[PDB]
Design a binder for these strands. Structure first.
Ligand SMILES: Nc1ncnc2c1c(C#CCNC(=O)COCCO)cn2[C@H]1C[C@H](O)[C@@H](COP(=O)(O)OP(=O)(O)OP(=O)(O)O)O1
Ligand SMILES: [Mg+2]
Ligand SMILES: [Mg+2]
Ligand SMILES: [Mn+2]
Length: 539
DNA sequence: GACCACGGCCAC
DNA sequence: AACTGTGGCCGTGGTC
């Protein structure tokens, strides 16, 4: 292109180079812009940001986050990645997109600006006529990128000293467990090495091997295997407690305090918008979509996520979301009725599983029902179900027969979805988000049946993900007008931060927005809670 | 140091 | 184990 001087005319496509992938931690090494056959390279990239009215180009949200970090309101606009991601959600990285639609992703801001321009022209062209995908782009993904940029730049407060103290406590408990494991093994070894543990359990000790690993065919030491060996030897019980504690310590307790941002004093994740095959978001660096909650220790970790002084956290979580979506997508009269009568299937399966009435179901029991209810729905085998619930085989088969007869039109929808996917090569959500599944006609059974379970899962999970994204787009402006903040999204959950005096009003309004985002044949119920910490806010 | 595959495991 | 699905991060063991 013809190199022209900075600044660029309005509407130009930006290219930028970061010192590291995390925009909140990155140094802006270079900045450029392309438009009208010209390329504009900025002398000083930081001051050159102030000249742009919009981040338009590849990975636009990342540059918008860095601008917010510097106190600049530079919103993200068009991004070829979002167009490619809607065309085919396997388009997840700029390296692939560039190769597939006419360019090369280099490490130079100018070339990245020119690439953004060329890729947008070609991808925008491939989308004309795909009115449903364009609707998703204009009404969901492009507006959503702006919401996510603000979430990423805002961050969440964390009780550092609390986790620091917790680490020392867990460390002492880990030493007690590993000391008994070594004694029981007769000698010490690296208990973190599953290869070394394999020998101790199955070679030195006489324990039987329950299963093999996928890629290398070693004797597995997974929780499901150790759980099956729980009575075969006392050492097994302690290895499971050792695994729980080292998992939480090495993944959450120790790394998270070291990630507080020096300017903000808060913890900043990244919400990746083109990372999943179903339309869900993902979270990384750090992932805040898998903070513990199951075990008592996991709850102590979740308590570390707190509200700023004078504020409160507001947590909103859709009820039985993918089951409600299934009712709407399938049209099953019976399942619709279940939610019109305010029934809760997780609680019901839980009572069934545990031989305990609804009133006596605790939060932990209900969680176990989710694996069952969603396991069965998405193709779980009778054999495994029997093994998970520790009950005979015929009983497990009976649960699955009862499950689907209760809602006959589900299997009809599954079959229509698969037949539709074989003819067109893709399945779609309620809004037209597509996932290509070419293995539906594979002539290897395992490969084909795997494709089938991914295929008919995507419309359900992806529709729920669509609803949440749309709700986030509608809610964000209402929160700014109330002086509240959107902090985290966990698939079907939102965590907000609100001034104490407006916390209750924010909770009400956020609940209404999420429930009336897009009415279905069943009502969307949202559970909401308020508290000083994340755990308190979901009760 | 930077990768990588793998087994394993946290969440939805 | 996996013959529910969607993710990302850990330590180990290995290569460069
Ligand atoms: N196992 C799954 N397989 C496939 N899909 C799944 C799950 C799963 C789970 C789980 C917990 N168990 C484990 O992680 C394993 O450990 C077992 C050891 O015992 C969630 N989803 C999907 C569908 C769901 O509607 C959506 C949001 O989730 P989530 O707000 O919590 O539920 P929900 O909205 O329905 O229900 P509530 O809000 O509580 O009303 O995510
Ligand atoms: Mg949830
Ligand atoms: Mg892996
Ligand atoms: Mn939910």
């Amino acid at each position: 292109l013809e190199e022209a001087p900075w600044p660029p005319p309005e509407g130009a496509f930006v290219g930028f180079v970061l010192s590291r992938k995390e925009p909140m931690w990155a140094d802006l090494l270079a900045l450029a812009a392309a438009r009208g056959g010209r390329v504009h390279r900025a002398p000083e990239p930081y001051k050159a940001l102030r000249d742009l009215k919009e981040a338009r180009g590849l990975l636009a949200k990342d540059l918008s986050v860095l601008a917010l970090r510097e106190g600049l309101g530079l919103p993200p606009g068009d991004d070829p990645m979002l167009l490619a991601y809607l065309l085919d959600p396997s388009n997840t990285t700029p390296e692939g997109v560039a190769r597939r639609y006419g360019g090369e992703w280099t490490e130079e801001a100018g070339e990245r600006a020119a690439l953004s321009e060329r890729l947008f022209a070609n991808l925008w062209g491939r989308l004309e006529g795909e009115e449903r995908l364009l609707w998703l782009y204009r009404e969901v993904e492009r507006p959503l990128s702006a919401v996510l940029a603000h979430m990423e730049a805002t961050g969440v407060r964390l009780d550092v000293a609390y986790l620091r103290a917790l680490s020392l406590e867990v460390a002492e408990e880990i030493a007690r467990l590993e000391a008994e494991v070594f004694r029981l093994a007769g000698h010490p070894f690296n208990l973190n090495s599953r290869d070394q543990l394999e020998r101790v359990l199955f070679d030195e000790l006489g324990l039987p091997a329950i299963g093999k690993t996928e890629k290398t065919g070693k004797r597995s030491t997974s929780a499901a295997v150790l759980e099956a060996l729980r009575e075969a030897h006392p050492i097994v019980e302690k290895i499971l407690q050792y695994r729980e504690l080292t998992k939480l310590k090495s993944t959450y307790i120790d790394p998270l305090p070291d990630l507080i941002h020096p300017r903000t004093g808060r913890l900043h994740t990244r919400f990746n918008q083109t990372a999943t095959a179903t339309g869900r978001l993902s979270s990384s660096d750090p992932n805040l979509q898998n903070i513990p909650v199951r075990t008592p220790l996991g709850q102590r970790i979740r308590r570390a996520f707190i509200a700023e002084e004078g504020w409160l956290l507001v947590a909103l979580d859709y009820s039985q979301i993918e089951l409600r979506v299934l009712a709407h997508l399938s049209g099953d009269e019976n399942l619709i009725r279940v939610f019109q009568e305010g029934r809760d299937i997780h609680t019901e399966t839980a009572s069934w599983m545990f031989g305990v009435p609804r009133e006596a179901v605790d939060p932990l029991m209900r969680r176990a029902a989710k694996t069952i209810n969603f396991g069965v729905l998405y193709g779980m085998s009778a054999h495994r179900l029997s093994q998970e619930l520790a009950i005979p085989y015929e009983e497990a088969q009976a649960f699955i027969e009862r499950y689907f007869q209760s809602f006959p039109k589900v299997r009809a929808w599954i079959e229509k979805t698969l037949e539709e996917g074989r003819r067109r090569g893709y399945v779609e959500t309620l809004f037209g988000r597509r996932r290509y599944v070419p293995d539906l006609e594979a002539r290897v059974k395992s490969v084909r049946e795997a494709a089938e379970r991914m295929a008919f899962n995507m419309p359900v999970q992806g529709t729920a993900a669509d609803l949440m994204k749309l709700a986030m787009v509608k809610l964000f402006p209402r929160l700014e007008e109330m002086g509240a903040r959107m902090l985290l999204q966990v698939h079907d959950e939102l965590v907000l931060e609100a001034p104490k005096e407006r916390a209750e009003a924010v909770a009400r309004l956020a609940k209404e927005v999420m429930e009336g985002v897009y009415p279905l044949a069943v009502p969307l119920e949202v559970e909401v809670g308020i508290g000083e910490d994340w755990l308190s806010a979901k009760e």
